[PDB]
Amino acid sequence: MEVKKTSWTEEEDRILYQAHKRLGNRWAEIAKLLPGRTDNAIKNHWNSTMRRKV
Numbered sequence: 863m864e865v866k867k868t869s870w871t872e873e874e875d876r877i878l879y880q881a882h883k884r885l886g887n888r889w890a891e892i893a894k895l896l897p898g899r900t901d902n903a904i905k906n907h908w909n910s911t912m913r914r915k916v
Contacts, residue, residue, distance in 0.1 A: 870907055874899070877895060878892070878904065889901045
C-alpha cells in the first residue's frame with residue numbers, strides 16, 4: 863500500500879525556502895527551478911512542512 867508520505871528531499875526543501883524569499887511567492891516561476899513539483903504540491907508541502915506552525 864505505502865501511505866502517501868512527504869517524499870520531499872532536504873535539497874528540494876532547501877531550494878524551495880531559498881527561492882521563496884529570494885524570488886518571492888512566485889510559485890509558478892519557482893517550479894522553473896523545481897520541475898515536476900506542481901504549485902499545489904509545492905504549496906501543500908510549504909504549508910504542511912515549513913509553515914507547520916506560524
